[PDB]
Write a protein that binds this DNA or RNA. Structure first.
Ligand SMILES: Nc1nc2c(ncn2[C@@H]2O[C@H](COP(=O)(O)OP(=O)(O)NP(=O)(O)O)[C@@H](O)[C@H]2O)c(=O)[nH]1
Ligand code: MET
Lengths: 89, 415
RNA sequence: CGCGGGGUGGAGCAGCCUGGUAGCUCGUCGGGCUCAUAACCCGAAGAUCGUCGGUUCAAAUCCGGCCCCCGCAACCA
């Protein structure tokens, strides 16, 4: 039950990218939630800047970071595919 | 016997300086007492264009000059035989204030040949009164029929009083004869005088639709930021209000202009193009874009770019000469007999070398350099990127004194 | 889980991704012009970023609790 730092900077290049996110919502994003068990929700929320603090919430404390890291890795892998740079500074 | 029905087109609205007797005018003749009463509606925000069908009717026996009305027949001249109808028309309107003046133009959408209600109680100069004249006066409505409202009881000299300065104002200039009508909308006393003055209409013939216009966008809130969850993204639809004519469902193929994106010394504002998915008409949406208040047109936006009023002055035009920095500006001006600043009546300097003035095209105000003195024409360079469509236009022009601004007149660019 | 600009010297601010130099366009006393100066020559002037805890090698820059203003913002006597 521990909240985390979890603040990164993502970038996506194409104009259709705005919708392309929903395309790869219909394709890519699934099961990551149930990768583990007993969580609440998943969220991506801005720092009031192009930086977004994300969130993964569950009872198991440590796995937070683990899972947290995995979610970052998503865009990373997506970057290795879809030209998505999750890079902060 | 009369029951023909012919040509019920071209609706008419009423606007002016704040609380000049507009709402009471669009509602002026509607119901009787039971239910359906008073004025306006439950929501005072700009919305609900048409009042739909308005009864306008007269009798036979009772004489023409003093008689026209909504409520069935007349109990003043007596009741014998069925009354005669005039025509089927809505009543539109638009708000305006320091903030809301713009709505005037867009509120003139369903409003063709608006009827104008001037003041009585309030004096002639007001910010949005002359603002009303020098702005709206070019919109193409010469059908404005001046109606003095807001007068209850005084020493009765008030009537002809409100007639005087107006007699000095128009008719010696553009906008030929405009009927001026004394009334009190306040007490429902003396309305028949407003219809007996208004019945006239302006001369120029016009067409229905299918032309090359441009709408301007308007207010809307910036929908919940990601803070909850990345969810709640329909794209963050935001929408505007129309001024001139239209065609169909199709609205935004191009978002002109767009984001700075920095880039060294000279920064261009780069537009973003898309086809339309949404177009909100209200609590539920429409196919075309309806004017008035909050409307939401399909725009796909993470809650960043929408720039909730970070970048003000929403600007929309169509096409372009295509190059992100395009500056050549040739303007033939007019201005005014004398200069009009703040309350001051004293003259301000004429054309001098390399003076700087606000060249504001649309909802942008852009730095401009009046430079070359051509006599009554000037060349004025701009910084932030913008695209004019045609030679026909009204440039808004201001003056620089110590971080402050004063509008000094008008001119038009010729492409 | 619908509230939006803000307050980075006494007018407007792209300050809150680039963790610790600080003004573009204001107002002022002391010199001002062997021609009147709202066009300006010398930017002298004085540093609480409005309360706060924490984080702190320091806070102009953060999460929150406190906020006094304008709110549905362009052809503005
Ligand atoms: N200053 C002033 N206000 C008045 C007078 N008579 C009525 N009013 C006010 O007018 C208000 C109605 O405003 P409203 O109808 O919304 O304004 P409007 O007159 O339609 N014009 P607009 O709405 O476009 O500004 C009422 O609250 C009423 O008190 C008057 O003589 N002087
Ligand atoms: C206010 O100063 C006024 N003179 C401006 C327009 S003329 C009515």
């Amino acid at each position: 039950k521990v909240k985390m730092s979890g603040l990164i900077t993502v970038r996506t290049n194409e104009p259709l990218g705005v919708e392309k996110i929903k395309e790869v919502i219909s394709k890519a994003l699934e099961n990551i939630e149930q990768d583990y068990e007993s969580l609440l929700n998943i969220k991506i929320y801005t720092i009031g800047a192009p930086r977004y603090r994300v969130d993964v919430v569950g009872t198991n404390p440590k796995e937070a970071s683990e899972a947290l890291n995995q979610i970052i890795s998503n865009l990373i892998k997506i970057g290795k595919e879809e030209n998505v740079d999750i890079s902060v500074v | 016997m009369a029951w023909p029905k012919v040509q019920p087109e071209v609706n008419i609205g009423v606007v002016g300086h704040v609380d000049h007797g507009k709402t009471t005018l669009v509602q002026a003749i509607t119901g009787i007492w039971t239910s359906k009463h008073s004025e306006e509606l439950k929501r005072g925000m700009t919305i609900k264009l048409g009042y739909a069908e308005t009864n306008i009717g007269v009798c036979e026996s009772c004489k023409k000059p003093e008689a026209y009305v909504t409520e069935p027949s007349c109990k003043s001249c007596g009741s014998d035989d069925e009354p005669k109808f005039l025509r089927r028309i809505s009543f539109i309107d638009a708000p305006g204030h320091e903030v809301l003046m713009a709505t005037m133009l867009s509120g003139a959408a369903l409003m063709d040949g608006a009827i104008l209600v001037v003041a009585a109680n309030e004096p002639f100069p007001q910010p949005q009164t002359r603002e009303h004249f020098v702005a709206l006066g070019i919109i193409g409505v010469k059908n404005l029929i001046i109606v003095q409202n807001k007068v209850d009881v005084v020493s009765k000299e008030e009537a002809l009083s409100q007639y005087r300065q107006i007699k000095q104002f128009t008719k010696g200039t553009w906008a030929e004869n405009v009927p001026i009508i004394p009334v009190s909308a306040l007490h429902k006393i003396n309305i028949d005088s407003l219809i007996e003055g208004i019945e006239e209409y302006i001369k120029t013939p016009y067409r229905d639709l299918s032309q090359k216009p441009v709408m301007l966008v308007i207010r809307s809130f910036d929908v919940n930021k990601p803070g909850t969850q990345f969810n709640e993204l329909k794209g963050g639809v935001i929408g505007g209000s129309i001024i001139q004519g239209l065609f169909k469902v199709d609205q935004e193929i191009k978002v002109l202009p767009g984001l700075r994106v920095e880039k060294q010394g000279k920064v261009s504002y780069e537009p973003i193009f898309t086809k339309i998915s949404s177009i909100r008409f209200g609590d539920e949406e429409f196919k075309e874009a309806k004017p008035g208040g909050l409307v939401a047109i399909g725009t796909y936006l993470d809650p960043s770019l929408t720039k909730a009023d970070n970048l003000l002055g929403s600007i929309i035009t169509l096409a372009d000469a295509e190059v992100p920095v395009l500056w050549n500006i040739r303007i033939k001006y007019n201005l005014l007999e004398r200069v009009v600043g703040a309350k001051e009546m004293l003259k301000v300097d004429p054309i001098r070398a390399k003076e700087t003035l606000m060249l504001s095209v649309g909802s942008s105000t852009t730095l401009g350099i009046v430079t070359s003195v051509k006599k009554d024409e000037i060349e004025v360079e701009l910084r932030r990127p913008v695209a004019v469509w045609s030679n026909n236009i009204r440039t808004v022009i201001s003056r620089q004194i110590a971080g402050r601004w004063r509008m000094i007149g008008w001119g038009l660019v010729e492409i």
